[PDB]
Amino acid sequence: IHLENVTEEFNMWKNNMVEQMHTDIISLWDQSLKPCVKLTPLCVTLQCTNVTN
Amino acid sequence: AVGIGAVFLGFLGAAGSTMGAASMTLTVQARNLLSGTVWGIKQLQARVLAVERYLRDQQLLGIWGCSGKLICCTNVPWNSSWSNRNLSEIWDNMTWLQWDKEISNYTQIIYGLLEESQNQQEKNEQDLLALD
Amino acid sequence: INCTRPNNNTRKSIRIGPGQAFYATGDIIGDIRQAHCNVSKATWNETLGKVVK
Amino acid sequence: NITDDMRGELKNCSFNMTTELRDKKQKVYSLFYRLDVVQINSN
């Protein structure tokens, strides 16, 4: 709802809520990995070669 | 098509008006103050911080003379050194924001004065009902 | 009280696995000595006199 | 210089250990106090 006869100074640069949002997104990013699977047995010697082309 | 009086009566709608006309609504502000795996912790401390604030303000009114009246009076006169403004101009000229930034230095004096004045009122009322 | 180990001590990192680490006592440079502690004689005597009092 | 009657309190222990990679094993040594190893059972 609108507000009238009103002067308010804003700032995006000294603004908060980008800080805790940058916290929260990486936090939920890590919450999306604890069910998932590690690859600790996979780091091993690799016999690699060029693809058929 | 919705009407302008409704958003006048909305939450924080009267922030720009004069304080005399902003007196006609406080209940919406008061009502929207109260309530309306890891994350619920943050949710929960936010909710209890809000009710801690609400109880602090209710206690500050409770130690004062008025509990649920929401519009009060007292028995300490206004020091003209605080404001020296005309009585006509304050209700029809200024907003609450600039009123707050004017009187914002004169704080915690008036609080203790209200405490003292109604403590004296309590002992006077106790004395009057003790003699009777 | 003074307390010391006088031996000069080198650590050594050992990678256990992928992104793992381990620290271990590598070489010891200097005199192979023995750790110890010291207290003042007469202070200890006087404080024991106080507690016996 | 070892005393035959007193005892030193530091032991040089070499052993197999894993690496970054699974198929590679390595030989590494360190030192330990007498009070954290025991003898299992000549060599």
Ligand SMILES: *[C@@H]1O[C@H](CO)[C@@H](O[C@@H]2O[C@H](CO)[C@@H](O[C@@H]3O[C@H](CO)[C@@H](O)[C@H](O[C@H]4O[C@H](CO)[C@@H](O)[C@H](O)[C@@H]4O)[C@@H]3O)[C@H](O)[C@H]2NC(C)=O)[C@H](O)[C@H]1NC(C)=O
């Ligand atoms: C990535 O590299 C791997 C390396 O192992 C590779 O897998 C191997 O590829 C070769 C060639 O594609 C496969 O050999 C074929 O195997 C099938 C199944 O047994 C046979 O039918 C094939 O025979 C045909 O070709 C012959 C050639 O002379 C003809 O004589 C015959 O008549 C058939 O037409 C051929 O032998 C091999 O089996 C795989 N091995 C495994 C384990 O899959 C893979 O293809 C590479 N992938 C990419 C994307 O580069």
Ligand SMILES: *[C@@H]1O[C@H](CO)[C@@H](O[C@@H]2O[C@H](CO)[C@@H](O[C@@H]3O[C@H](CO)[C@@H](O)[C@H](O)[C@@H]3O)[C@H](O)[C@H]2NC(C)=O)[C@H](O)[C@H]1NC(C)=O
């Ligand atoms: C570290 O790991 C290696 C690898 O397992 C160990 O080496 C192996 O030790 C065994 C027994 O000590 C050896 O068997 C013996 O080998 C000798 C020499 O050929 C032979 O005469 C004996 O009859 C018996 O077969 C084995 O060969 C040896 N393998 C390798 C690759 O070294 C080692 O003991 C571990 N510890 C240290 C401190 O290195």
Ligand SMILES: *[C@@H]1O[C@H](CO)[C@@H](O[C@@H]2O[C@H](CO)[C@@H](O)[C@H](O)[C@H]2NC(C)=O)[C@H](O)[C@H]1NC(C)=O
């Ligand atoms: C313990 O031994 C190490 C051996 O490296 C000493 O470190 C050296 O000290 C000298 C002089 O202080 C320096 O010139 C070298 O550059 C140092 N080397 C390293 C790798 O740091 C260390 O000073 C000794 N500590 C004591 C208390 O004697």
Ligand SMILES: *[C@@H]1O[C@H](CO)[C@@H](O)[C@H](O)[C@H]1NC(C)=O
């Ligand atoms: C394999 O890769 C190397 C380097 O990318 C390339 O020179 C070579 O032609 C490739 N193919 C074979 C069959 O070696």
Ligand SMILES: *[C@@H]1O[C@H](CO)[C@@H](O)[C@H](O)[C@H]1NC(C)=O
């Ligand atoms: C409020 O008080 C401070 C010092 O107490 C003073 O510097 C400031 O000018 C005052 N503000 C107003 C609006 O009087």
